[PDB]
Structure formats: structure tokens, C-alpha cells
């Protein structure tokens, strides 16, 4: 699962303080270093010798090979008595969903700053051939230093593992059409799917819910496949500037061939504005207390 | 399937010999006890904690097919931990079994085969089905020189895989439209069968599909490049311009420009006047 794993009980180094919740899979615990007192988040997953180790192997590999200020910090992993423990940064404010349900709608400048920081994390991930595939407020954390960090590579790991399995059982390819060979090797979609999720997340930070949240999940999926499909928009026009409406319009470009990349989005009017600094986030954290 | 017979298939058929299956299972040559007709019985072993989704999709595809160019379905039996799918037996086996003894097929024999496969393909696509495994091994020839498509194994596996995507997709509110589209539809369409028929036409002509001596992973990688050139027949002088054009048109790299099976039925190669089962009866005489 990981050549750098510690075959030791994490409870030798950490006091488990409380079960904070969970992600796509696993259970997350708040933990404290026994001697220093430093806080960490320990994600525990059941790991038997018979289980497929590929998903968790890929999640650890993404966390270990990410060296970025906009990606949650990784400290190491533990394997002890059929339980895998992934040790990561403990972000004191929690997720942006934890924040906006107490604080309400973020201001346009706070959203602009979060979007820029997320786009820097996405530009980095995409440059290293990775796709997050689960961009949303619940997966964007704010640490005590006011930094915006992408978290939960669970879906990304599951998708990488599913793609490796498909290649293993693809069979003889001599009669396969090139587009069949392409979805077997790449998947049918690309990293631009993360740009659309950031557009939906910016609406979620403004409205406390993604668009169509009240609509049945299957109806949402079917409508996206229909011919006359129109992407979502911000509900209250006058509350937001034209730069925010345009950010939603371009990130939510229906065709992936015309959806801008993460680096191209960094020069967009909304995220290239002058007043975007960590002070906006430190002031968001002050409102929480 | 609700119409599954809960009896031993040996009550109605005499098992004659094991022949080996396709994608999955084992196929037995068998004889109908009342008519003396041969049938192919596909046997799949069962275990109590087995996912029955793929098997269920294969039976449903076969039970709803009613076309001369697709193996006929005669029912399925569940007995003593085994599932038996009963289908049409084709006396000469597959085109691969034939050309391995006979050698290369003539252009007119290939044109008859292509027309018959396109009739089956046009039918399958009209019913919203995809074969996905068109090749010499899956095109059977009966004693009368007639053509039947066989082995909906890959087709059933893909269908089962796609149904399992719709079940474990999770909340879709942050999901881009193209991600939603591949989860429901798959990322490719029925036009993949047109390409496979082009490669199959080359396989019948040259005894191997193009790049057969190149590593499978290298072939897969080459195809994804934006400079990949579709294959062509090696001996230009051995074939007519119409066959060379059929190959170029079926092997259109872009699935947006690749013609449908119904469109291909109007192509010169397969709409020619002398195409009939007699051409395959000549092939079978060469075998004996
Ligand atoms: C416990 C989780 C989920 C519930 C959320 N309300 C708060 N959250 C965190 N809070 C404080 N520090 C944290 N560090 C990390 Cl990593 C997470 C985190 C957040 C989201 C997904 C995953 C995973 N896979 C981990 C975290
Ligand atoms: C026994 C099989 C496999 C080996 C091949 N050499 C000859 N072949 C047939 N030959 C004569 N009639 C047949 N009818 C049917 Cl159906 C098949 C068939 C062919 C291929 C796959 C499957 C399945 N699932 C069934 C068949």
C-alpha cells in the first residue's frame, strides 16, 4: 500500500480526541501529539490482507507526491491490526461548508480569493497529471493560518484504481475503435471537469447550496445529457458584480472543448482583481469566533 | 430472467462434446432430443454469492433479438448450480475456424460477409444495442453458408458495468455534464462496431488483424494519439478500389464522421449484384 508506511499503532504517538466525521470513505479523528500537543487529522480505513489495496495505495501516492500550498498537508500513514490511518493536516476552521453554515454567504471578494486559491491547487494537480473530481465546499479547508487547502482525494483514488483495473481486463485490442481505446486509457473525460465543479462551488459559497439541490439526483444527471441543457446561474443577479456572473458563465461552459483550463482561469477578471489577500480569510475566521 | 427453466437441460438435449466458450463460460455442442437439430449450450458455473447482472444482461440481449443474422435463442436452464444458455449451432463454426484451414477469403466472399454483418449491426443498433466484439471469431457460418453474429459477452459485461456506474455515482450536484454523460452512456457509441467490421474485413483478407505482431499496450497507446493513421490493406493490387474505399470509410478515425451500418449498406462493395450464400458454400467446399 505504501513503501513509507509505519507498521505501528498511531495511538503510540497520538491521543485520539474525537471523531470529527468522514470523507468519501473512512472515519476522520481529531488527534493530538502526546508530547508537543500539535493537532492532526487521522483518517482510518479498514484494511484486511484480502482487500484490494489499489484505492488507498493511490490516495497515499497523490497525497505524498503533492507539494503544494493549496493542498492539505500529509504527514504519513500507519498500518496496525488491519486498520490504515492516514495522517493529515488538522484545519482548525474545518471546511468552507462548516464556515458558511455559521457565517452565511461569503462576500464576493472572499469567494474570489477562495476561487483563486483553488485554481492554483487545480493548476498544480493538473500539471502533475491528476484530477481531483470532488471539488466542493466540504472538500476545501481553511487552516488557522488562513490558507485554502484542497482535501479528500478519495474519489480521485477510486477513479484511478477503476481505470487501472479496466486496462488489466481490456483484452485483445486489435479490432477496437480508437475512441474505445481512448476511454480505456484516459476515461472519456479530462481535468476540465474540476473547472465546472469550481463554478458550482462558487455558487454554493454564495447561496449555501449548489444549484438544483432540491431536485432528485437522477433527474439532475439525466437533464445534463439532454440536448437543450442550459448550465446553472446565480439566483440573485443584483447581489453580485458582472465579474462574478462571468466567472460562473465561463467555468460552467457545457462543452469541455471550450471550458478554460485552470491556468487560463487565473487571468480571469474575478480572480486577478487587486484586493485578494489572506486578510479576507483571516477576517472570515474572526467572524466565526 | 423470469422465463428460466428450472430443469436439467439433459432432459431435452443430449450433450455431445465440449467446444470451449468465448468471453466467458464453456460451450457444448448438443442435440435436441425431439428434432435432432444441433444447438450450442453455453454453461456458466454458479455460486450462491454471485453477481448475476452480466448473465442477466446477456440473456435479455439474446431473448429480445429476432433477426436472421444474429444467433437464435432457445431458452436457458438453471440446474445443479449451473446456468445453460441455449443458442443456434452453426455447423461450419466461425470464420476464424474456417480461414485457419482455408487461408485468405476472396473479395466477393468478404463482401457477402460484410453485407450480412451490417444487416445484423443495423438491427442491433436500431434496438439500442452494441456488439463491441465484432471479429472473425464472432461471425459464425452455418452449413447453408449463412452468417450469424455470436457472443454478446463483452456487450453484457459493458451493460452490467454501466448499470453499476449509475448505482455508485454519488451526489451529482457538482459533477460536470460530460462526467454525468459517460456515467449514463459510456463515452463511445455503436459506431465502434463499424470500425471493428473494417478490421474484420482486413483480417478475412490477410489472416491477421492489422498490427497483430505489435504488443497490445503499444497498439492501444498508438490509437489514442492525434496523429494515428487508420490501417489499410497490404497488397493494393490484389483488391478493387471499392474494397479499398470500404476499408477507408469503415475505418474513419473520428466517430462523428464514421457512417452508420444502414449508410454502409448502400456502399458499392456490399450493394453489388452477385452477393449470396453460394460464395460461402464455395469457401466450405474448399474446407472439405
Ligand atoms: C473531519 C473532516 C470532514 C468533515 C468536515 N466537517 C471537517 N473535516 C476536517 N476538519 C478539520 N481538519 C481536517 N483535515 C482534513 Cl484532511 C479534513 C477532511 C475534510 C474533508 C474530507 C476529508 C477526507 N478524506 C478530510 C478535516
Ligand atoms: C462453440 C463455439 C465457440 C468456439 C468456436 N470455435 C465455435 N463456436 C460455435 N460454433 C458453432 N455454433 C455456435 N453457436 C454459438 Cl452460439 C457459438 C459460439 C461462438 C462464440 C461464442 C459463443 C458464446 N457465448 C458461442 C458457436
Give an account of the 3D structure.
Chain A is an alpha+beta fold. Chain A has 2 domains: 10-89, 2-Layer Sandwich (Phosphorylase Kinase, domain 1), CATH 3.30.200; 96-288, Transferase(Phosphotransferase) domain 1 (Transferase(Phosphotransferase), domain 1, Orthogonal Bundle). Chain A is 40% helix and 15% strand. Chain A is built from 11 helices and 7 strands. In chain A, the strands form 2 sheets. In chain A, strands 1-2-3-5-4 form a 5-stranded antiparallel beta sheet, covered by helices on one side. In chain A, strands 6-7 form a two-stranded antiparallel ribbon. In chain A, helix 1 packs across helix 4 and helix 6 (193-207) packs antiparallel against helix 8 (242-251). The longest helix of chain A has 20 residues, at 108-127. The termini of chain A are far apart. In chain A, 38% of the residues are buried. Chains A and B meet through helix 5, helix 6 and helix 7 of A and helix 5, helix 6 and helix 7 of B. The complex binds the ligand C[C@H]1CC[C@@H](N)CN1c1ncnc2[nH]c(Cl)c(-c3cccc(C#N)c3)c12 (2 copies). One ligand Y3O binds at residues 19-22, 27, 40, 42, 71, 87-90, 93-94, 97, 140, 150-151, 153 of chain B.
Amino acid at each position: 500500500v505504501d513503501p513509507d508506511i509505519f507498521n505501528r499503532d498511531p495511538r503510540d504517538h497520538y491521543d485520539l480526541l474525537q471523531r470529527l466525521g468522514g470523507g468519501t470513505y473512512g472515519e476522520v479523528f481529531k488527534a493530538r501529539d502526546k508530547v508537543s500537543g500539535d493537532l492532526v487529522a487521522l483518517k482510518m480505513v479498514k484494511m484486511e490482507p484480502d482487500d484490494d489495496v489499489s484505492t488507498l495505495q493511490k490516495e497515499i501516492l497523490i497525497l505524498k507526491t503533492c507539494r503544494h500550498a493549496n493542498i492539505v498537508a500529509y504527514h504519513g500513514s500507519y498500518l496496525w491490526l488491519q486498520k490504515l490511518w492516514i495522517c493529515m493536516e488538522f484545519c482548525g476552521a474545518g471546511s468552507l461548508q462548516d464556515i458558511y453554515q455559521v457565517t452565511g454567504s461569503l462576500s464576493e471578494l472572499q469567494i474570489s480569493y477562495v476561487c483563486r486559491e483553488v485554481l492554483q491547487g487545480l493548476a498544480y494537480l493538473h500539471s502533475q497529471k491528476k484530477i481531483h473530481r470532488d471539488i466542493k465546499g466540504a472538500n476545501i479547508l481553511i487552516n488557522d493560518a488562513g490558507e485554502v487547502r484542497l482535501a479528500d482525494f478519495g474519489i480521485s483514488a477510486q477513479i484511478g484504481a477503476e481505470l487501472a483495473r479496466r486496462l488489466e481486463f481490456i483484452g485483445t485490442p486489435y479490432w477496437m475503435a480508437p475512441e474505445v481505446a481512448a476511454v480505456a486509457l484516459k476515461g472519456g473525460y479530462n481535468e476540465l471537469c474540476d473547472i465546472w465543479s469550481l463554478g458550482i462551488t462558487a455558487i454554493e459559497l454564495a447561496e449555501l447550496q449548489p444549484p438544483l439541490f432540491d431536485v432528485h439526483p437522477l433527474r439532475v444527471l439525466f437533464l445534463m445529457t439532454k440536448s437543450g441543457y442550459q448550465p446553472p446561474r446565480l439566483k440573485e443577479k443584483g447581489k453580485w458584480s458582472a465579474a462574478f456572473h462571468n466567472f460562473i458563465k465561463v467555468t460552467l461552459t457545457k462543452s469541455p472543448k471550450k471550458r478554460p483550463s485552470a491556468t487560463k482561469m487565473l487571468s480571469h477578471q474575478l480572480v486577478s482583481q487587486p484586493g485578494l489577500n489572506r486578510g479576507l480569510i483571516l477576517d472570515l475566521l474572526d467572524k466565526l469566533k
